[PDB]
Design a protein around this nucleic acid. Structure first.
Ligand SMILES: [Zn+2]
Ligand SMILES: [Zn+2]
Ligand SMILES: [Zn+2]
Ligand SMILES: [Zn+2]
Ligand SMILES: [Zn+2]
Ligand SMILES: [Zn+2]
Ligand SMILES: [Zn+2]
Ligand SMILES: [Zn+2]
Ligand SMILES: [Zn+2]
Ligand SMILES: [Zn+2]
Ligand SMILES: [Zn+2]
Ligand SMILES: [Zn+2]
Ligand SMILES: [Zn+2]
Ligand SMILES: [Zn+2]
Lengths: 72, 74, 72, 75
RNA sequence: AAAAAAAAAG
RNA sequence: AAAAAAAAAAG
RNA sequence: AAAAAAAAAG
RNA sequence: AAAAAAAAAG
């Protein structure tokens, strides 16, 4: 078994039974962000990939990277 | 003929029933026509006919399940 | 919490809280339907009639078939 | 031509990529034309261009992955 | 080769 | 209570 | 980074 | 309301 701190982009809808990444079960973003070192942490951490839906992405819980100028 | 229903699919974009009869939301925006929307292929959110497991204290602002009165969101 | 009842989706089950038994081998369990090992990975019968009936040709199918279906 | 490919999807009926460009088998029967089949919506099984994880010892008679020579199956 | 690249209000 | 996070640590 | 390379009989 | 009751060879 392998375990990484990198965030799984599929979250609770991941269906890879050998997935080595972290999975969020809360819409709350972890208070430590990308600095969190808890392997089984259930809060959200940033995904290192640009959001397909850009500055106009309407999902306030989205963990992908957005341009500046997007207001929550 | 068609067996499709206006009732909302509780799994949304994560439904993997290849024969699902229900409506699927692909937007986080709630449909402006509400539960009265009659467009079978409408992609906006509509209420699900099932009680939310998380009850009056559910804090997911996109949740489409049914909640008791007095639920408060930020 | 866990049940001896066979999961009808096997390795393709995506219920993260599933309480049923999952076959990871196409070999049928030598103890049959009355096997009581909770983590047994061999096949046991599903409690549902096969949609494909007496003419089902999938030799690994665990659903229920009428007696006229004979496997080579 | 179109974006669709004749290459076989390795996930079959359990594929959940809504943008998948590959061919999907809905039968355990292997296509009589094999890897030479050019029908883009063919539902029968064709060889996958990837080595089987279970190698010469694979006993799944419906497996579409590549195997070493010397694999045997029940007769 | 698994995000809603389906846009109608994204 | 057979596919939602009734898994809680801040929900 | 989505096959059962998880084995007890594969 | 998650099996290929979608068929061309099932
Ligand atoms: Zn994952
Ligand atoms: Zn954390
Ligand atoms: Zn986004
Ligand atoms: Zn559905
Ligand atoms: Zn609508
Ligand atoms: Zn709710
Ligand atoms: Zn299951
Ligand atoms: Zn057993
Ligand atoms: Zn069958
Ligand atoms: Zn072209
Ligand atoms: Zn595919
Ligand atoms: Zn073919
Ligand atoms: Zn194989
Ligand atoms: Zn990565």
């Amino acid at each position: 078994s392998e375990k990484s701190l990198e965030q799984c982009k599929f979250g609770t809808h991941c269906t890879n039974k050998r997935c080595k990444y972290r999975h969020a079960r809360s819409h709350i973003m972890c208070r430590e962000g990308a600095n969190c070192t808890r392997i089984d942490c259930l809060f959200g951490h940033p995904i290192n990939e640009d959001c397909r839906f850009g500055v106009n992405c309407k999902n306030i819980y989205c963990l992908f990277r957005h341009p500046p100028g997007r207001v929550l």
